[PDB]
Design a protein that fits this description.
This is part of a larger assembly, with three copies of chain A. Chain A is mainly beta. Chain A has six helices and 32 strands. In chain A, strands 17, 18, 19, 20, 21, 22, 23, 24, 25, 26, 29 and 30 form a twelve-stranded mixed beta sheet that branches. The first copy, chain A, has a five-stranded antiparallel beta sheet with strand order 2-31-14-16-5, with no helix packed on it. A five-stranded antiparallel beta sheet of chain A has the order 9-8-7-11-10, with no helix packed on it. In chain A, β10 and β11 form a beta hairpin. In chain A, α3 packs across α6. The complex binds a molecule of 6 linked components (NAG-NAG-BMA-MAN-MAN-MAN), a molecule of 5 linked components (NAG-NAG-BMA-MAN-MAN) (3 copies), a molecule of 3 linked components (NAG-NAG-BMA) (3 copies), a molecule of 2 linked components (NAG-NAG) (9 copies) and 2-acetamido-2-deoxy-beta-D-glucopyranose (NAG). Chain B: This is Envelope glycoprotein gp160.
């Protein structure tokens, strides 16, 4: 028979693509008026009733390890933090000689030498006058020059003090696609991050993603619906990190019990430096606590899921971190504005062979000079928070690394890992992909154009 | 052909946090005038062509 | 060990300079080309 080309405009066809998504937030942040970086510089109001269309018959290939959404989110968060820090105070004058003594006023043995009482000369609002002041500095934030100390950052760069009016608390962020692009979502319960998905949908915006910055433990994230999920770009390659998603959260209570006082020191015209004035009461180690039974059950489930890839009879070892700097060797996070680094050796100290409120306690240290994003030369100073700090969070996942193993295959040991925040974003964006619409189609019909 | 024959040493001086000033530390050997060289015949021919034009 | 044509072209200049610590000064020296410096009033 006679067939002719026919053109269709607006056909449902798409290809894998990369683009620039935009971000949306709920009105609640606008009602806080605490100047959240995301709601202030990047995001717009969220749609009251987001649209989700379920694509019947559609099976789509996903790969969470080659998703540009993660890269865009990493770049966006870094840029927003830098932008929020631009108008803040630069602590150049703070790079001076410090005369430091111990703080032995009712301290515990574990907190001996952790805090230092440092006196120094500082500039005033008058360029021709100097003021002798004192402050308390954490042992990690100072280094001995030769009783003489200097700030750790003084030989690398000057730190920018965080503006107390700016809030970095994670508020949910939705990523939304512009014209000509779509976001596809995999709703399979046992989707491992790579391969086909048979239950696909298209969404205007992603679900509320909280950009939580943490290491060795994913906090306040999404949970698996059926069972614990193990995800890795290549499980057999020990050099690739493993992302573990829990089906039930694990409560973690972190606290700084020391009652701290914030003191303002005028270092220039309109320039104030917020230091630690004094400690009211005794000095105790900040610490985190998790239930022993819940952690043991979660580790058992994780081991059960790992044995599907590493053998039903292989011995599984959970050991602490190998080495590196404080950020990677410790569970690092932000509690009420203070930067905690906690020792997780008590969490990964187990053996499994394939055969009640003890409340595991993790000691923690606190830092004020912060190097984020694994960068160098852009240090940030965190002003102290007045009072006693307590936060409660949910461990929803882990980042793990496997040792080489020597190919013996008899045993496998896993250690907490992290550092690169891109894995944290992948833990939430694994189910999303971006596609570009191709609206033009050509097909045969019996329709023929007039002459 | 242009040349600086003096063997120069670069010295870093820390003038602030993360701020380094790169100065001339010392000269290894004798100090000679930097200079350029061009062939006399080639330049003369080129100038002759320029004059002709 | 300079040549006659390069006499006075280079100068050995000592000066006090700031350090990474705002309250400390370091005495340093450098070599400066004659064209990059001007006499104030050695
Ligand atoms: C995982 O998710 C959980 C829950 O989502 C989260 O825990 C939450 O953490 C946030 C921040 O750490 C908590 O919010 C703070 O809560 C304290 C405690 O106040 C309680 O009681 C008041 C009474 O009205 C309630 O309104 C309040 O909601 C709490 O129930 C507040 O004091 C905090 O507000 C102060 O700080 C804010 C930020 O600085 C200021 O914007 C605010 O104006 C308040 O200012 C105070 O501090 C200033 C210095 O910072 C000072 O200058 C002021 O004068 C004033 O003193 C803040 O609202 C929240 O309660 C937690 N929720 C639960 C259930 O625990 C985890 O943190 C999260 N995990 C991670 C890793 O992110
Ligand atoms: C970190 O380091 C700084 C500096 O070293 C410490 O600051 C010092 O704290 C001590 C103790 O509080 C101060 O000494 C005390 O000052 C009290 C306040 O009096 C002021 O006014 C009087 C009258 O003009 C002055 O003589 C005096 O110097 C102060 O300027 C005094 O009342 C205290 O003496 C009286 O009370 C005590 C306690 O009851 C008695 O034992 C005495 O006999 C007397 O009756 C005492 O002199 C000191 O002045 C502070 N220095 C500065 C520069 O501020 C921080 O405490 C320290 N912090 C930590 C955590 O270690
Ligand atoms: C996920 O991660 C795993 C683990 O890293 C990868 O598996 C590795 O794959 C590589 C490449 O195929 C393997 O290396 C190759 O092994 C071949 C088999 O030889 C075995 O025995 C010899 C004995 O001497 C060992 O040296 C060797 O490592 C193997 O154990 C070799 O024949 C290959 O040699 C040839 O290729 C190399 C590389 O081009 C050349 O340099 C050589 O001259 C030669 O031409 C090669 O060495 C590796 O052994 C695998 N490891 C394991 C544990 O299985 C997966 O590939 C990865 N998956 C994805 C998708 O990336
Ligand atoms: C620009 O200007 C600067 C400053 O004026 C010059 O820097 C000086 O250079 C001279 C010559 O090199 C230095 O003097 C020499 O220092 C040598 C290094 O020794 C050091 O340690 C000893 C022991 O602690 C100290 O005593 C000494 O001061 C140094 O700190 C000495 O070894 C030299 O003496 C010995 O060797 C010579 C040569 O063999 C013998 O003749 C002596 O008898 C003795 O055995 C000599 O003292 C001087 O220290 C430098 N000053 C600074 C501040 O660095 C630059 O050289 C100049 N550059 C140019 C291009 O003009
Ligand atoms: C803040 O600045 C003041 C003034 O610069 C510092 O005090 C000064 O400290 C120096 C060094 O200790 C004193 O010089 C020394 O004096 C002793 C005698 O006490 C003498 O033996 C030494 O040879 C040396 O000359 C100087 O006199 C002193 N000036 C004062 C007290 O007015 C102070 O130390 C600075 N504070 C901090 C925390 O750095
Ligand atoms: C990781 O796990 C191991 C094994 O559970 C821990 O080592 C064990 O720690 C317990 C508690 O400290 C030890 O029991 C103690 O024994 C001493 C000596 O008999 C006794 O005086 C105490 O009263 C207590 O009963 C146990 O012996 C010890 N075992 C080994 C092999 O070292 C280890 O501490 C854990 N690490 C972390 C960081 O939690
Ligand atoms: C770097 O700074 C130091 C200290 O400011 C300078 O040394 C100082 O130089 C002045 C002027 O030469 C000295 O004052 C003078 O002292 C002489 C006695 O030697 C006296 O007769 C004068 O009336 C005048 O008071 C001062 O004492 C001296 N201080 C020291 C050496 O500690 C140095 O010159 C500076 N370097 C450069 C390259 O500018
Ligand atoms: C001041 O603090 C420093 C740092 O903690 C103390 O130095 C340590 O002191 C203990 C106790 O004598 C020694 O065992 C250590 O070897 C010292 N060095 C380190 C690196 O810990 C110092 O003793 C304290 N001094 C006072 C008077 O409290
Ligand atoms: C940590 O996880 C617990 C349990 O999932 C959360 O508590 C529940 O929160 C939901 C919120 O919709 C409530 O509907 C439930 O009633 C709460 N209790 C239980 C037993 O599920 C808690 O909110 C989580 N905390 C954070 C910070 O995410
Ligand atoms: C995630 O699941 C996919 C399949 O749904 C896995 O990919 C298969 O891996 C096996 C080896 O275990 C191969 O033989 C198949 O050819 C692969 N097929 C496809 C379509 O990829 C993938 O390995 C899983 N990833 C994990 C468990 O990390
Ligand atoms: C931390 O220290 C401050 C200051 O000492 C405490 O504030 C006092 O609170 C009591 C009531 O608990 C009041 O009667 C005082 O007037 C307050 N003093 C002030 C504000 O200077 C605060 O309660 C302490 N917090 C904790 C948890 O101990
Ligand atoms: C973390 O803190 C919460 C409270 O913020 C603790 O929950 C309490 O647990 C005790 C003992 O089970 C109960 O008696 C209280 O009623 C609970 N209060 C609540 C739920 O608001 C929780 O036990 C702590 N977890 C630790 C210390 O591991
Ligand atoms: C975290 O806690 C563990 C145990 O509580 C500490 O382990 C000790 O580490 C020292 C220093 O290398 C070893 O000599 C001891 O064998 C360990 N003791 C125990 C109880 O196992 C570990 O030091 C802590 N991490 C850091 C870096 O402080
Ligand atoms: C310029 O000076 C440097 C330093 O004096 C010379 O570097 C030396 O080179 C020789 C080989 O020619 C080595 O044996 C020395 O170990 C080097 N010393 C260093 C690097 O400190 C350099 O050769 C000189 N260049 C010229 C063109 O003379
Ligand atoms: C500029 O330098 C080049 C070399 O970089 C000189 O070229 C050399 O010339 C001599 C003499 O004619 C030859 O023996 C060499 O073989 C050449 N080397 C090359 C071409 O690599 C050139 O003569 C110089 N010109 C001047 C000094 O005017
Ligand atoms: C230091 O350098 C200056 C600048 O070249 C010298 O000043 C000249 O010295 C020559 C030689 O005596 C005189 O002929 C000139 O008149 C001077 N002035 C100028 C502008 O060239 C000075 O002599 C040098 N001194 C030493 C000790 O080397
Ligand atoms: C891990 O545990 C061992 C043994 O207790 C200890 O020597 C090592 O320092 C620990 N590593 C970290 C990063 O805490």
């Amino acid at each position: 028979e006679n067939l002719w080309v026919t053109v269709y405009y607006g056909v449902p066809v798409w290809k894998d693509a990369e683009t620039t998504l935009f971000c949306a937030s709920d009105a609640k942040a606008y009602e806080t008026e605490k100047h959240n970086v995301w709601a202030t510089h990047a995001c717009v109001p969220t749609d009251p009733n987001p649209q989700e269309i379920h694509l019947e018959n559609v099976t789509e290939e996903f790969n969470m390890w080659k998703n540009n959404m993660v890269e865009q989110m990493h770049t966006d968060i870094i840029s927003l933090w830098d932008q929020s820090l631009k108008p803040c105070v630069k602590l150049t004058p703070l790079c001076v000689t410090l005369q430091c003594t111990n703080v032995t006023n009712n301290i515990t043995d574990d907190m001996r030498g952790e805090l230092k009482n440092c006196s120094f000369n500082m500039t005033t609002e008058l360029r021709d006058k100097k003021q002798k002041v004192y402050s308390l500095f954490y042992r990690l934030d100072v280094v001995q020059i030769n009783k003489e100390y200097r700030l750790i950052n003084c030989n690398t760069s000057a730190c920018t003090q965080i503006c107390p009016k700016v809030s970095f608390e994670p508020i949910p962020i939705h990523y939304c696609a512009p014209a000509g692009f779509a976001i596809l979502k995999c709703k399979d319960k046992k989707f491992n991050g790579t391969g086909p998905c048979k239950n696909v949908s298209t969404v205007q915006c992603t679900h509320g993603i909280k950009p939580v910055v943490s290491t060795q433990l994913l906090l306040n994230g999404s949970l698996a619906e059926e069972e614990v999920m193990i995800r890795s770009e290549n499980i057999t390659n020990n050099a690739k990190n493993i992302i573990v998603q829990f089906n039930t959260p694990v409560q973690i209570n972190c606290t700084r019990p020391n009652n701290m006082t914030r003191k303002s020191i005028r270092i220039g015209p309109g320039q104030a430096f917020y230091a630690l004035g004094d400690i009211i009461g005794d000095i105790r180690q900040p610490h985190c606590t998790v239930s022993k039974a819940t952690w043991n059950e979660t580790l058992g489930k994780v081991v059960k899921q790992l044995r599907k890839h590493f053998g039903n009879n292989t011995i599984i070892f959970f050991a602490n971190s190998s080495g590196g700097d404080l950020e990677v060797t410790t569970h690092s996070f932000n509690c009420g504005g203070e930067f905690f680094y906690c020792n997780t050796s008590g969490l990964f100290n187990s053996t499994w062979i394939s055969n009640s409120n003890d409340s595991i306690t993790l000691p923690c240290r606190i830092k004020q000079i912060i190097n984020m994003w694994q960068r160098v030369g852009q240090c940030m100073y965190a002003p102290p928070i007045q009072g006693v700090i307590r936060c409660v969070s949910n461990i929803t996942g882990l980042i793990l690394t496997r040792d080489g193993g020597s190919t013996n295959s008899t045993t496998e040991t896993f250690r907490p890992g992290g550092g690169d925040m891109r894995d944290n974003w992948r833990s939430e964006l694994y189910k999303y992909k971006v596609v570009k619409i191709e609206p033009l189609g050509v097909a045969p019909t019996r329709c023929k154009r007039r002459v």
